[PDB]
Amino acid sequence: MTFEEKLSKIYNEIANEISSMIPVEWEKVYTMAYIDDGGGEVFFNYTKPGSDDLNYYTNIPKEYNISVQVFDDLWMDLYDLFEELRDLFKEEDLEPWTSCEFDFTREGELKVSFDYIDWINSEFGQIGRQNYYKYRKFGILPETEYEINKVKEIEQYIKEL
Amino acid sequence: LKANIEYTTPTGHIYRTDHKGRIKEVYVDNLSLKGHWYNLEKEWQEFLNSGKEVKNIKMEVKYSRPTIFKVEYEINGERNIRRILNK
């Protein structure tokens, strides 16, 4: 297999894992992953057909008949897939990514965005990252001043990299 | 692995690299359907100092190869999950 054939195999595996974590029909899924050697985070938002509303992933057990344990154990497998995606870069002697945007539609479109920002040494937290992500991806502002100011600190930080 | 290059695979997959030749973008119309702890505590404390509750902190542990922590917590009525390795 070529490098891009290995990447395609794991794209498909990541997409189908996310899809099986969603207990209703979805139209689009926006996934963000921050991963390095010491750990990381993976969240996603999905939409349903007929609406543009974003549905956060951990709200799935709170809204539907799926146990938190089953959901989290699936999340664990999903993380492993992204770590696999990351190890593929290591094996190609490529600098491994520290963030991966993973957006796909039910029709089969997939757009991926990798970045290499040293997030852990930036000392910005998980929610700060997520709020910055959400402001750039969608148009969403945080609503508290501490949160809003943290996004501004991350913006200035990145431009000056 | 070339710089500022776009390339398309036999299967239609489009790849874009940066000035260092790292993959930054991929297009696919073809889908078949100190550290981490410090990073985590620092943001928790900042939320508390701003008058926000950090609730329902739980951990799952795969013990002792690194020990694996699945950390979870809620802040704005929203549960977040995080993975931390100890090695």
Author numbering:
A (entry chain A): 1 to 161
B (entry chain B): 470 to 502, 557 to 587, 592 to 614
Give excerpts from the publication.
Here we report the structures of EsaG, the nuclease domain of EsaD and their complex, which together reveal an inhibition mechanism that relies on significant conformational change of the toxin.
However, the toxin, EsaD, undergoes significant conformational changes during the complex formation. Noticeably, the N-terminus and C-terminus of the missing ββα-metal finger motif locate on two opposite sides of EsaG, with a linear distance of about 44 Å. These observations indicated that the separation of NF and CF of EsaDc by EsaG may stretch the originally folded ββα-metal finger motif to make it become a disordered loop and stride across such a long distance, thus abolishing the DNase activity of EsaDc. All the secondary structure elements of EsaDc are involved in the direct association with EsaG, mainly through hydrogen bonds, salt bridges and hydrophobic packing interactions. The CF binding is contributed collectively by αB and β6-8 of EsaDc, burying a solvent-accessible surface area of 3825 Å2, which is much larger than that of the 2461 Å2 in the NF binding site.
